[PDB]
Design a protein around this ligand. Sequence first.
Ligand SMILES: C[C@@](O[C@@H]1CC(C(=O)O)=C[C@@H](OP(=O)(O)O)[C@H]1O)(C(=O)O)P(=O)(O)O
Length: 427
Amino acid sequence: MESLTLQPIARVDGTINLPGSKSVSNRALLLAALAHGKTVLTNLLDSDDVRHMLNALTALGVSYTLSADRTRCEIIGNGGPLHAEGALELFLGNAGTAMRPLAAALCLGSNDIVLTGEPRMKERPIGHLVDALRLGGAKITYLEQENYPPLRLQGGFTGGNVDVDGSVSSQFLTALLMTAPLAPEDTVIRIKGDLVSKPYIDITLNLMKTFGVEIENQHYQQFVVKGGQSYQSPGTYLVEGDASSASYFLAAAAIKGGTVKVTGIGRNSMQGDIRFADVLEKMGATICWGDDYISCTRGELNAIDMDMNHIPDAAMTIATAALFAKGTTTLRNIYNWRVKETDRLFAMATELRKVGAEVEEGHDYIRITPPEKLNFAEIATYNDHRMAMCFSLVALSDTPVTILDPKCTAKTFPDYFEQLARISQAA
Ligand SMILES: C[C@@](O[C@@H]1CC(C(=O)O)=C[C@@H](OP(=O)(O)O)[C@H]1O)(C(=O)O)P(=O)(O)O
């Protein structure tokens, strides 16, 4: 069991050029692969999740080249649905943005492909997506547990009236939206009830439009898609910096700055996590917005009680930042924290208590009362990149913290600790 011990950080200040957005990167790679023409992506993220997508595209026959730092990618579009037979197995690690979108996209036409991944991926739900794809004609078989990967996809999605449950993951609707335009028949996607993580749907629609496709969004309750479309290369495309990755550094300044500026995202960003900055501001930090940067300057830090459904991932950063706030913080409407890399409500509560906090683990919320002073703990990270990055903030105090399996940050941010060190100052 590898580990990293962070010594106390007296102050943070500086500028971080953000790694590319994982959400945008994997969507752009899949659309570029399906599109006609050559797409040149820049500021692409090099992380495990993107590498698994690139490996899947390679296995499917897509041609592409990567620059030395793997942030520039020239993709030769396939000019239509991707194909493979012989129950070709695509190993997708822990990448939800590869598993959910490919589960739908590979249902176009005929195919015989198996999607699988790390053990935890076999415990992340996908039944709502499979249910929807089958209504549209796809043949899908669960090879292990019903409602979870691995899946054997044998094609057949032609379109039509499709209902989809949007209460557990926005990724199921995202997958359907990207796939439907290429189906031969028109599709009407009806959302059964609630829709969580709504901002991610906006990311998907923004990407689809860049690649030449638009659909009719009826107040997010129903989406009308015309079939027989084709994605088209947008030429050169700049991937936004990752707003979720940015949360750690902006939070660090709110706790111990100084001023930390993150570049690559700004007021015009399509990512919902830029709204994390609004939460820091509500807590007492100062935020500055630019066209290509967001910065945070230390002010004060007061507890908040907020519904965080719109920023589920960045919300985790508020849970550890809460250790430094005055009062009890409550984060609500975050049930799906339980069905991701790990059950994050259980993990976050468990690890927060280890450093001294009093924590109520609610079914779909978490209440955190900070201790007068933090204590040392060896933090378990549950194979979850965000647990490692969130708990790195514990070192913005008088106590060191040891993070187990620090390399798990590579899912989305291989250079995380070097970047945190870059803004860490002794004086
Ligand atoms: C969980 C994850 O990030 C997810 C990425 C994502 C997207 O569409 O890009 C939407 C959200 O899932 P949901 O709330 O709609 O289910 C994020 O939490 C991560 O980075 O941990 P993953 O990409 O593994 O699903």
